[PDB]
Amino acid sequence: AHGCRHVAIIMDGNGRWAKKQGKIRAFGHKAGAKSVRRAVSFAANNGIEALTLYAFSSLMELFVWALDSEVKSLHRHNVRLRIIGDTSRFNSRLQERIRKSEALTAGNTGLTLNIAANYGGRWDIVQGVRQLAEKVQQGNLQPDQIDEEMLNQHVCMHELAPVDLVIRTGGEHRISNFLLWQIAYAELYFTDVLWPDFDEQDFEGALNAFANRE
Amino acid sequence: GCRHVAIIMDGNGRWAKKQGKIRAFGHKAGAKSVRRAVSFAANNGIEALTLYAFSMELFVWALDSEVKSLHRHNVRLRIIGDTSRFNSRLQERIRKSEALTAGNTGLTLNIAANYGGRWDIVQGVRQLAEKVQQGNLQPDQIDEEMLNQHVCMHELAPVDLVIRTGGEHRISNFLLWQIAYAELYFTDVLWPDFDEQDFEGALNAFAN
Ligand SMILES: CCCCCCCCOc1cccc(COc2ccc(Br)cc2P(=O)(O)O)c1
């Protein structure tokens, strides 16, 4: 009914939330983690095909390690987990844990959850361009055959539904080098709600704003 | 301060309809609002203003008669977008207007005509792809900096602020690469009604 197949979220405000309560930044990150679990469960229960999350605050590897402790519980919720981002310089043990987590849940049929780790929209475009340039160098591809559809096939998430809605919590009104190519046609929803307070009703509100606007 | 503002100029058609007038009248009021936004940016020290007509060859034509005045105001005019299939006479006029004002050092006005943000990236990728094919470039040498050099506006200040009139909350395949770190300001005001006060309102959001 809400019309949304793929929702992307810039999760900002963890720092400000902890500051408001006299607490250090790490309590904000723990409340922020509870808010991810809540959003993930909401998305899965509301028929969304894909949820893409970008951890930002107005130690990437620490975030991803943290996530390794959630993977068993995601799998038990029938979530297919993927990491998007430049993980090539990450630790070898971490990179192995990523591969395995992805292998483990690739057969799940419920929500597809994409976690940005060391992700940038410009980087994502550049990596697609490098894959195309290799194919030209091999003699497989003509410069002239390159069009939007082709580059589209080489950026992250090209095999998922297009992103219909981007939500950014925390009160800033920019993209901050999250998805660029993929958000050419997306609805953009900005809320002053800080990430740890963003709850089901807030998520419902963004979906119903997309349904009324589309 | 804000050095480069981009505007998606939506609401001319809806404005016509609200005024109980045919579409043509909304275009004519939209053109007046163009002149007022260009003056306002020239007067307020904005370095670059990038205008996306949205809701083409005909739009470029209407600008043709403004060039003399722009040049007199030290305005550098550029058309961005795929004009390669516009009739050759119009292409020739674009080329002449650009060359006339190319040495100007005041406000740079970019008018996006048959422009798409994905297109813009792709024509940059195609250039790089030619370089690879001629052995002038290794695939692993391609980085953000280098792609940036091949997309529109790489010689101007980075886009600081994008304004969309008309009530929609989308980029609609206007700038993509260039807006990675820009402030996005959406307003329900229709483009023909957007005036100096509205533009200052957006500049304040940036200042905060
Ligand atoms: C200080 C650093 C903060 C730690 C960051 C933790 C990362 C966010 O926690 C999550 C991250 C990604 C996905 C999830 C999803 O968690 C769940 C999803 C569905 C279900 Br059922 C259960 C969980 P969980 O084991 O109850 O939290 C949580």
Smallest Cβ–Cβ distance between B139 and the set A133, A175, A176 belongs to A133
Q: Nearest residue of A to residue B120 by CA position?
A: A148
Cβ contact (<8 Å) for B170 and A147? no
Q: Rounded to whole angstroms, what are the CA distances from A152 to A11, A121, A214, B111, B194?
A: 25, 13, 23, 26, 35
Q: What domain range includes position A158?
A: 1-214
Mutate to test the pocket of ligand 1, among A74, A81, A98 (most ligand atoms within 8 A of CB): A74
Chain-chain contact of A132 with B121 (C-beta, under 8 angstroms): no
In angstroms, what is the resolution? 2.0
Q: Is residue A13 a contact partner of residue A172, using CB atoms and an 8 Å limit?
A: no
Indicate which residue's Cα is closest to atom 21 of ligand 1. Answer: A77
Q: A60-68 and A92-105 are packed helices; what angle lies between their axes, rounded to 10 degrees?
A: 40
Please report residues of A whose CB lies closer than 8 A to that of B177. Answer: 122, 125, 180
Q: In this structure, what DSSP letter does residue B114 have?
A: S
> Which residues in A62-92 are b (16+ Cβ under 10 Å) and which e?
ebbeebeebbeebbebebbbbbbbebeebee
Nearest to residue A50, comparing CAs of A116, A130, A128? Answer: A116
DSSP state of A138: T
A78 lines ligand 1 (CB under 6 A): no
Nearest to A173 among B132, B176, B185 (CB): B185
Q: Look at chain B and report how many structural domains it folds into.
A: 1
Instruction: Name the one residue in this structure whose structure tokens are 């260009």.
Output: B38
Nearest-angstrom CA–CA distance, B17 and B190 = 12
Q: How far is CA A189 from CA A167, A169, A192, B62, B171, in A?
A: 5, 9, 10, 35, 12
A46: CATH: 3.40.1180.10
This structure was determined by: X-ray
CA distance A44 to B132: 44
Pocket of ligand 1 contains residue A176 by CB under 6 Å: no
Q: Is A82 in the pocket of ligand 1 (CB under 6 A)?
A: no
Nearest CA in chain B to A187: B170
Q: Is A12 a catalytic residue?
A: yes
